[PDB]
Design an enzyme around this catalytic site. Structure first.
Site, PDB file in Angstrom:
ATOM      1  CG  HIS A   1      47.555  59.776  -8.251  1.00 35.02           C
ATOM      2  ND1 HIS A   1      47.117  59.623  -9.551  1.00 35.02           N
ATOM      3  CD2 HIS A   1      46.511  59.438  -7.461  1.00 35.02           C
ATOM      4  CE1 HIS A   1      45.863  59.206  -9.545  1.00 35.02           C
ATOM      5  NE2 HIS A   1      45.468  59.093  -8.291  1.00 35.02           N
TER       6      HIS A   1
ATOM      7  N   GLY B   1      38.754  56.949  -4.946  1.00 30.14           N
ATOM      8  CA  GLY B   1      39.272  55.601  -4.891  1.00 30.14           C
ATOM      9  C   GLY B   1      39.109  54.792  -6.157  1.00 30.14           C
TER      10      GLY B   1
ATOM     11  CB  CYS C   1      42.692  56.533  -9.256  1.00 28.49           C
ATOM     12  SG  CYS C   1      41.930  58.148  -8.905  1.00 28.49           S
TER      13      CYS C   1
END
Lengths: 306, 306
Positions: free
Chosen positions: A41, A143, A145
């Protein structure tokens, strides 16, 4: 002596963290040999995540739309591919910091360390457990991830987790490094049911053994029990059922302390039924289930890595 | 979201741990530039530890009586010296892995990360607080001495602790990197009394603010108190007195949450006298005092280091 929730030393993993940017979205990636791994993503805007068609979003993207930065170094992207819910980037340069490593899909109830990262830079390290419902209770802000979880055996890093999602309930969900989610979750901004979360029974028992080794013994009782009798109590308190495989794993702790596994189950049964009466065990007022039997043995013998 | 007891990433410190041997005794040392620091009781046998004369014991030793291993490479000691309770070893090679660093003497209530080490190899990392009585509650087995505690500010490692002693009561005592003990302790194997330990009040308040930020608000109320009446209740429960310095430190958390410091203290006052029932805060059944206000802000805004 003493007993702490200890994480693995994180040095080998810090040298593999990079920043990946695609359009306006930046998150963390993992650089091993000449491949960079990151959550797919990264290609999504905030509006895309409500219902993303990842194949159609990825086809608009070329190698030069992916900005991969290791420290102050730009990496040159020479290929990209989607594997399940992770993107893999073939880059110009092999990471000279690459440790010996494996990719591993862990089982519910196993523990691992998390190196939380923002913009490719490490912020903190902590230990945690894969819950029986395949979530983790982490600490992940916007942030984070692409942050990864790992175990270390001597000189080999076993990567087992990549962070992808915060569920609307506030718990966290992610994948192994082949991009397959743990649990039924998907990388989409929607309501997603996790199962009932149960307590990891074999871990609670290992930590009771740790307590006895450290001198904390008030909960030892005059009772014993059977597996089937214990599991009837386990089910009532949303504890995971205990099996002979679990009894076998606890063998070494049983031998060191001289307390038979079924005798320690009877102490646990009595704690479940009577509570802890405001008392503590190893500085905790609750029964702790984030130490595996292996974790307890490691801490009580001082096993190192380097 | 989520809140965890996070340690600093330990990579910069892992590259400075060595193994120091002296006869039958091996412990950990810290290799910075061309100097290896380690606890002076490395020159003691188990029998010597009962009543050591360190100056006499050190005189019996020469520069070659010391045995320094880094990974597999052997270091060449070309000198030694004793600064308070640490030995300073001059080696042949400056550590090429030496980070930017500072030596710091911390204050009670401040927190740091511990890299637990055995034979010069990192075993695990955890976060802890200097207690108001200048002990720490760590996890230290035999051979962990010389393990160090540290903080990181962007790119500079601040070394604040070196492990020396396990007290007969199972708590831990050590020095700064100039070799001055925290607290009234000495590197002699005798009975040693530590003060009464109090709870770090400013830290408990910081953690209550962390709980609000993370959606746990049940303990809030519209009561109040001034600084002076809170402190009457404070000890009575063995809590450290709260000063205006402490209120000032909590200012930014007060502004982020819209809860005045004094109102948060009035929530704590209520918590001390009736307990938490069977209720939890941030997954804990006790009040947590190992997060400083600066720790909470770091985690909730995602400060990185690299």
């Amino acid at each position: 002596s003493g007993f702490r929730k200890m994480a693995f030393p994180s040095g080998k993993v810090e040298g593999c963290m990079v920043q990946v940017t695609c359009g306006t979205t930046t998150l963390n990636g993992l650089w091993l040999d000449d491949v960079v791994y990151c959550p797919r993503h990264v290609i999504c805007t905030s509006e895309d995540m409500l219902n993303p068609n990842y194949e159609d979003l990825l086809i608009r993207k070329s190698n030069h739309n992916f900005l991969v930065q290791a420290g102050n170094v730009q990496l040159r992207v020479i290929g990209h591919s989607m594997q399940n819910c992770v993107l893999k980037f073939k880059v110009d340069t092999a990471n000279p910091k690459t440790p010996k490593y494996k990719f591993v899909r862990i089982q519910p109830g196993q523990t691992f360390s998390v190196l939380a990262c923002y913009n490719g830079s490490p912020s903190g390290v902590y230990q945690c457990a894969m819950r029986p419902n395949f979530t983790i209770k982490g600490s992940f802000l916007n942030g984070s991830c692409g942050s990864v979880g790992f175990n270390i055996d001597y000189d080999c890093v076993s990567f087992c987790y990549m962070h992808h999602m915060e569920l609307p309930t506030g718990v966290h969900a992610g994948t192994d490094l082949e991009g397959n989610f743990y649990g039924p979750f998907v990388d989409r901004q929607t309501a997603q049911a996790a199962g009932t979360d149960t307590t990891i029974t074999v871990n609670v028992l290992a930590w009771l053994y740790a307590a006895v080794i450290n001198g904390d013994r008030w909960f030892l009782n005059r009772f014993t029990t059977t597996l089937n009798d214990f599991n009837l109590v386990a089910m009532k308190y949303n504890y995971e059922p205990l099996t002979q495989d679990h009894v076998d794993i606890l063998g070494p702790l049983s031998a060191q302390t001289g307390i038979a596994v079924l005798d320690m189950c009877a102490s646990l049964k009595e704690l479940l039924q009577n509570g802890m009466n405001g008392r503590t065990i190893l500085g905790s007022a609750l029964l702790e289930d984030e130490f595996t039997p292996f974790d307890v043995v490691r801490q009580c013998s001082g096993v190192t890595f380097q």
